[PDB]
Amino acid sequence: FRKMAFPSGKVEGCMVQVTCGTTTLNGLWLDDTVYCPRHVICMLNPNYEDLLIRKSNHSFLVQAGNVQLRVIGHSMQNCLLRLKVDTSNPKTPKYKFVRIQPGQTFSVLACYNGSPSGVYQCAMRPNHTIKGSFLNGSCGSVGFNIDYDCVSFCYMHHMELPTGVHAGTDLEGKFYGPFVDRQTAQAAGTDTTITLNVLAWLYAAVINGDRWFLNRFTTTLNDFNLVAMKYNYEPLTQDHVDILGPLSAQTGIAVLDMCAALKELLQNGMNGRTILGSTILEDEFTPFDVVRQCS
Amino acid sequence: SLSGFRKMAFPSGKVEGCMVQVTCGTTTLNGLWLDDTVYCPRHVICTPNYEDLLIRKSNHSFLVQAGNVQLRVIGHSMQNCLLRLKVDTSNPKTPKYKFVRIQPGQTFSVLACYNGSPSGVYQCAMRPNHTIKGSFLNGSCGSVGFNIDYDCVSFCYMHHMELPTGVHAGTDLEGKFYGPFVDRQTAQAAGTDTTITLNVLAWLYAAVINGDRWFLNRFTTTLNDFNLVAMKYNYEPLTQDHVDILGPLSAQTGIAVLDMCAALKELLQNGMNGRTILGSTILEDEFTPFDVVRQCS
């Protein structure tokens, strides 16, 4: 089972570079607008309204490849800037902006000075951070999902946290998690394992012909949680159970029977065995990802 | 420093613009459209003796579609295990490209496609046993693997089939299989696989570059003594050529390769004691020396 990303071509044709002062980062160019982190206009104590009113259109240099786009308008929306440009992007895909929930997955097109370098698939952690791979220059890189040619943009990268994970906003500029765009002492909160995803991934393992970790027990939802919550697992709800419906129907293993398998895995370990080649329980595939990569 | 690595694929857009659907009878799969040629598995003509099966086929036998666009086939020939279909339209999205034959251990990105439509991209390595551990569903035959170097796409893999263990086999872009496999159903099986020692060393170097260095020690080993241990843990033998490939990582860190081998030998014998190296609890073997630089830039 491979952690697959969505093909990045539709997003690559939207990436541009935005410079203000000596500060450069990425922006997303859709139609006649460029979106980028507002910190492109910047310390420990920024007042963005006060920093922005001091700028004009010609304060911003926007480049698509080696070609300048003229800024003819700007506004700030939460933690993003929206720059109106004189050129409309002919390669703008059909798109939406979406704010995803913790536990959901997405592809990141990692970019440096407006040029795409790599693509990877990740999950938003329950604490709203992402375990990515961002180097100096990657702010403004975006995450997305693709559904029948429509790009749903869900993430724009803003900052690195002390524990070496990442934080960002949705494409309305609102941070995921309790984070702010300045250099404060701010830290990643407590995190949990994404239970729903682990169960999805155990279903993937059954669908791909592996059954070793099954057992003869069932469990109630309550009794499952009492165990799994001891292992730093997210509480599982009836809604999460319901979501596992298609996978359960497809394999013939009732969701609560799979929970009983998981309980035994947590309590007894894997004991030198692997699942889908992994020595550890994987939590970055949603039920939707499994259906995409299985069916 | 980086706390961990992701397996990162190349941006796929240059390759997406080259994917088409090829249909011949009831068989449909993916092709690669570069200039006025479409390259696809020769087994598109099948539901043995391809030479003969292909005499029974004409240009009109082949339906080629690039999204909604019909590309009329105006010539066909077989090259090893590929069909080359000349079409009426040179692909306007052809990137700068090369065809290269990948070596065992090396990595590349795969753009998984379904009936001509790109569905996902992931990074994989050519295993020592000449198979890849991929994700290819119904309709993914013809998907391609590649690397990109300064906007030149080097194609190295085309997917042909899945083996009984669930691993995958394919050819280079001249149609010559990787490993002993054939494009026909036989009892063919993947040979036992080994861990890619070169890449494991590379990723130990990446760990050090990123400040994770608890596993280092003040001792060295000979190549032979390391190989006795490695081989006992089902690792590939390290050759002098491999030692030279690690030269740039070794120079940067001032850690001699055989000194890193000494670190690795202790890790294999003693395990990791529950610690992580670059955020992994296992020794990773799908990042090459080149991949390490790329992720560290």
A42 has catalytic annotation: no
Sign of CA dihedral A115, A120, A124, A129: negative
Burial bucket for residue B62 (CB in 10 Å: 0-12, 13-18, 19+) = buried
Note whether B11 contacts A118, CB cutoff 8 Å. yes
Nearest to A2 by CA among A200, A291, A276: A276
Answer whether B135 sits within 8 Å of A293, measured CB to CB: yes
Residue in A135, A277, A279 nearest the CB of B297: A135
Q: In chain A, which residue ranges form alpha helices assigned H by DSSP?
A: 9-12, 48-53, 195-207, 221-228, 238-243, 245-251, 255-268, 287-293
Give the closest residue to A40 by CA, choosing from A56, A26, A30, A53: A26
Same domain, B77 and B205: no
On whether the CB atoms of residues B5 and B206 are closer than 8 A, the answer is yes
Query: Using an 8 Å Cβ cutoff, are B47 and B26 in contact?
Result: yes
The Cα of A82 is separated from the nearest Cα of chain B by a number of Å equal to 25
Clarify whether residues B108 and B173 are in a common domain: yes
A235 and A105 housed in the same domain: no
Phi first, then psi: what are they for B17, rounded to 5°? -70, -10
**What does the alpha-carbon distance between residue A232 and residue A250 come to, in Å, rounded to a whole number?**
29
β partners of residue A35: A28, A82
CB contact under 8 A, A118 and B166: no
Catalytic residues of B: 43, 141
**φ, ψ for residue B274, nearest 5 deg:** 65, -5
Q: Got the DSSP string for B12-43?
A: -HHHHTTEEEEEETTEEEEEEEETTEEEEEGG
* CATH code (residue B124): 2.40.10.10
Q: What angle do CA A218, A220, A223 make, to 5 degrees?
A: 105
Are residues A164 and A198 both part of a single domain?
no
Q: Assign residue B199 the CATH number of its domain.
A: 1.10.1840.10
Regarding whether A238 and A226 lie in a shared domain, the answer is yes
> CA dihedral in degrees (B251, B254, B257, B262; nearest 10)?
-170
Examine the domain organization and report whether B12 and B129 are in the same domain. Answer: yes
Min distance B117 CA to chain A CA atoms (Å): 10
Q: Which domain holds residue B269?
A: 194-297
**A261 in the same domain as A235:** yes
- Domain identity same for B173 and B259: no
Q: A206 with A183, same domain?
A: no
- In B, which residues are within 8 Å of A116 by CB distance? 11, 13
Q: In Å, what is the CA distance from B81 to each residue of A268, B48, B76, B155, B195? A: 49, 12, 13, 16, 29
Boundary-marking domain end, from B193, B208, B225: B193
Task: Assess whether A129 and A174 both reside in one domain.
Answer: yes
Show which of A93, A121, A152 is a domain's final residue.
Answer: A93
Is residue A24 domain-shared with residue A166, that is, in the same domain? no
Same domain, A134 and A277: no
- Decide: A138 and A111 in contact? Cβ < 8 Å: yes
Q: In chain B, which residues have their Cβ closer than 8 Å to the Cβ of A94?
A: none
